Amino acid sequence: QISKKRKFVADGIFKAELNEFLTRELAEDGYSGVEVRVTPTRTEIIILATRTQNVLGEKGRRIRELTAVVQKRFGFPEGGVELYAEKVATRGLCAIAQAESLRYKLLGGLAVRRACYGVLRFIMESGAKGCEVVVSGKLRGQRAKSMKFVDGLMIHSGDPV
Amino acid sequence: RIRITLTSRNVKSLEKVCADLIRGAKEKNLKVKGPVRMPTKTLRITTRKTPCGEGSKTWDRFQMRIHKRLIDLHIEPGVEVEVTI
Amino acid sequence: KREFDRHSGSDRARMRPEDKRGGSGPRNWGSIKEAFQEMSLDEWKLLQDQN
Amino acid sequence: LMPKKDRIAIYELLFKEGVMVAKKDVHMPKHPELADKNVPNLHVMKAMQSLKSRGYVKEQFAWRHFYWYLTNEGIQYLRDFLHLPPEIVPATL
Amino acid sequence: VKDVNQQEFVRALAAFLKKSGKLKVPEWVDTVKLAKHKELAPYDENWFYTRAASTVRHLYLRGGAGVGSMTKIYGGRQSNGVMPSHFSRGSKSVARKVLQALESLKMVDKDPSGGRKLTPQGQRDLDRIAGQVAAAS
Amino acid sequence: GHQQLYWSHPRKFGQGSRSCRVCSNRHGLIRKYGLNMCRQCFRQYAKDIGFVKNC
Amino acid sequence: QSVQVFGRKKTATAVAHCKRGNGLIKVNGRPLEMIEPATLQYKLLEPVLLLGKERFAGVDIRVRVKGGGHVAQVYAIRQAISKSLVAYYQKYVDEASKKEIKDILIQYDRTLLVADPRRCESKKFGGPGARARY
Amino acid sequence: GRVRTKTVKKAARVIIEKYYTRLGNDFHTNKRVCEEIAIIPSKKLRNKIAGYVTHLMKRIQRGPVRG
RNA sequence: UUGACGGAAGGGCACCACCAGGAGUGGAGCCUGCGGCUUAAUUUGACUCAACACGGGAAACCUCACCCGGCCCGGACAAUUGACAGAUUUCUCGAUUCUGUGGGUGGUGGUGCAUGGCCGUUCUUAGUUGGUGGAGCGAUUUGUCUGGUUAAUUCCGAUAACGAACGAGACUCCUCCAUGCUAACUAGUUACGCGACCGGUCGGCGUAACUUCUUAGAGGGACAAGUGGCGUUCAGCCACACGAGAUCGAGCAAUAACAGGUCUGUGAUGCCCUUAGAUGUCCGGGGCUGCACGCGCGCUACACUGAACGGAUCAGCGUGUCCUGCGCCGACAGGUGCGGGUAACCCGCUGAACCCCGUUCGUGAUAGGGAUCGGGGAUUGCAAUUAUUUCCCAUGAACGAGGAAUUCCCAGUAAGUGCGGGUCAUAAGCUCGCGUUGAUUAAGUCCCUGCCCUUUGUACACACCG
Ligand SMILES: [Zn+2]
Incomplete structure (x- = not known):
């Protein structure tokens, strides 16, 4: 029996901890966020990744390891x-x-101008x-440098951002 | 008599499942009470912007609105449903 | 507190960032050039305790 | 320095499933998963540290917790430590 | 008790409550001050009759008040010296003993839902005084 | 008698018996709505929890 | 035959129940001349002193007020009583008598029939109030 | 501070140069015309565009507008 | 040539500038923050705006980083454990610490002048940049401007430029209404019966009508639209009618910069340092509160436009597993039993304060002021002494509007007034919000002080901290 004010906060804290854990875990797997669809019967986690073959194990063991790690961290039943x-x-995009x-x-160790310009055209x-x-x-030096690369138009202020 | 409580953080998705619940139950010839809109709750959190003490006393205000609607008869992500008797 | 903040207190880097070899090199920024299933342990604990 | 009873209880739980989680709390009295056995939470995080240093387990971290995963080297080591045949497998395989 | 001035109502009701010598009026009415935020005791000697006349008047308007409510009704500002002033509730024992005194006159009884309400006898007595202040004005 | 002395200080209240659930920090903690996270980590996970800036 | 019109000050919402009968004007059961602030007693009597008691001698008015402060309820009561008679003279009396009442109340003070939208401004950080700073 | 942005003025001139026969000297009539012949994502922007159309319509009836 | 800068000129803008004024601050006491002193330690960061009620930093322990004492290993990886007795003798655990050589590890340790990320500031000022065309060998320039207008490089207009992009605006959340919809036994009204009192009162009880009040969805409404005047009769401005309004309050916020803040928010982090007689870590005690003093945010005042005593009478924001209602006990602070509320349901119709109405007080250091101290009652907690708070009695100080200076502010605003949230076992003189009462003056100007732009000068370009 938990109030709605703490429940909606607890629902957001779970999604915040679940998302951050998958960033440190699926970093080299093209992780791009998750979608948590909670139903009164069960909860389903949708992992978004550009390389799904690596999110799954050699025979589908990593996906079994993640769902076994989530059920133990957040008290989810078997x-x-x-x-x-x-x-x-x-x-x-x-x-x-x-x-x-x-x-x-x-x-x-390629570059910051050749690398960013290459990823700027792919977008x-x-x-x-x-x-x-x-x-x-x-x-390569003690002083920090800021390399900015822009292309097209970008909206900075307002709600459309 | 069954009272269905609907609580969500987005009114568009909350009223979308609310209209489908009334329309889905009105075709079954079930006398339903209209959607009673509870007063919205805004979870205020006014924090300090800077992670240190050097900021010019600039605070940032956060809000987390929780809209609540109940349906008394005789689902999209982000909407909580709880039926009673 | 420092008297002259803009004056670098090091002989290795000034206040203005200065690249090494003009940005050329492997780990550098870049120069301005032309570049474009059997049973688990739960079942084993029962088979060894049933005898 | 942990008792041999608590030394194998951590490995059996790590082998029963394929993963092992533990909150980074050296002062927690009992592990949430090893509640029936009087296993301090410090023994769980320190026994899994010895496995990580030998290439048996890879770890992660989510703000207070470790996430340990048995590798192929670690499954075979616990298979010999727990005196098990090559027939048994963790729940993630 | 309406249709008349409420400030002269509590003064005439206290006179009726004093002329009818049946109120309790505990022994410590000369030493106590009516709240912790008060500096001095009430100037009026018969403050227990003035508060009892005002207390039964609040029960006529909002029944089921209780001791915790009359403590809030008669609260006020609390000067904290060099610190800002805040609201302070009144006295609990003074509000409790003045409620039991009205019950001895059969004008107040325990409310079934909450605290204490007004009796048909107290509602009659309050309306009689409410008629005297109207004719005398 | 070290087992009866190690971590024997009563920690049931105050700033020492609670810390941020994100980085184990005890300063700037936000206890409202059961957040239990320091004020610097809440700004990081404000969007993920559902706290947006309207005004 | 009755109307229910509300008058709104900053946060004082006064709803007048103009119903046919005799010349009864009460606020929360208490007479109009019995409201606690005696300094603002004439502000509550402006709809009666301007329109005359003969226009109110055929309708009972029972105002219920809640919200705001003492002064806000005063301006909300006199506004509810002013508009309740106008709305009554519109639905149960001819429109000519309505204009005969509105032109008297509007020419004196527009706040008897039109509520002012002035509300308290939100406080900004870095200052004690809305405008002032530290 | 009643100066219209280039978004309001440019969109108002294109509406006139394409729908001059539908517009007039009434704001509320032009307010409904611009709502249909132009997809404006806002209502305040529509009232600003239609309000400047009414202003320009009063200029066309007296002479040519330089825009 | 483009920047940067100037102690050169011109122009422009802004209650973090002025004018006209309001409330003050600076003076008093005290509460706090920073220096300086002192100290086994009085941790430390930050020092013009853009440090100093700041690190959400209101520190009894913990926090804790400081100080002085004692354990502990939580020594990855490539015999040894605990312990009764008392100020040294035994027993126990069983490969889990085996001691060394390796060389991991953790820090509130240094470096914010090695960095990331955030944030502050420049500046929330209006600025910034392509395409095509044009000028120049070129870097670059024009567009991006004499002027008018606008909160605004906002527009009109001028026009070798034309057409656009970011910023501004639009947008988002807000309050102002809409007796028109959609609906409400967790909101109410009204009509009814019922019943207490002398047709009036009733948040005193009950389920039929339907949405004014309450709640919140959708859709409307306002756009300088209408009128008059001033204007390249353009952009717009001023004054009016109508009307819920005729500049409403946040958020977001460009190009680019700082040697701005932060390693003490991070299992963000490079390097250095300390690594077991430890800068790890735990447990005690103390400190951060220490006081000839020099300042910075504040609170309370110097009263009769008032203090008291009593009567009456009105909020909103919001929180609640802890918030709190009733019946008893007590003078208060408390205590105690029975309860409700994971909440539009209970606290709660949030009976707030100022205010209003009576009553005494009567230039008076006084019934102004409640600082400083004494003696007691309680509550919080493992424990308050250096008084945690709180109550009661007593003690009754400076302070009679405050020097040179200086701050904030243009309408529900200033100011007064109280409430709530954050901190919180105990908890506001702080801060973030909320309602309440509610003005004076102003619809203007470069005079001052701040930046911006143009022109001009440069041997500056790490860019005058040159
Ligand atoms: Zn944190």
């Missing part, structure tokens, strides 16, 4: 939670997917009206 890995289309694609080119060809990539931090 067989009460189900995870459905889904494939998101138009990867260029996903800011999280393109941030991962850029991060895995930086740790490879423009994907049907985007505008993009903006900002890379800040230190690299």
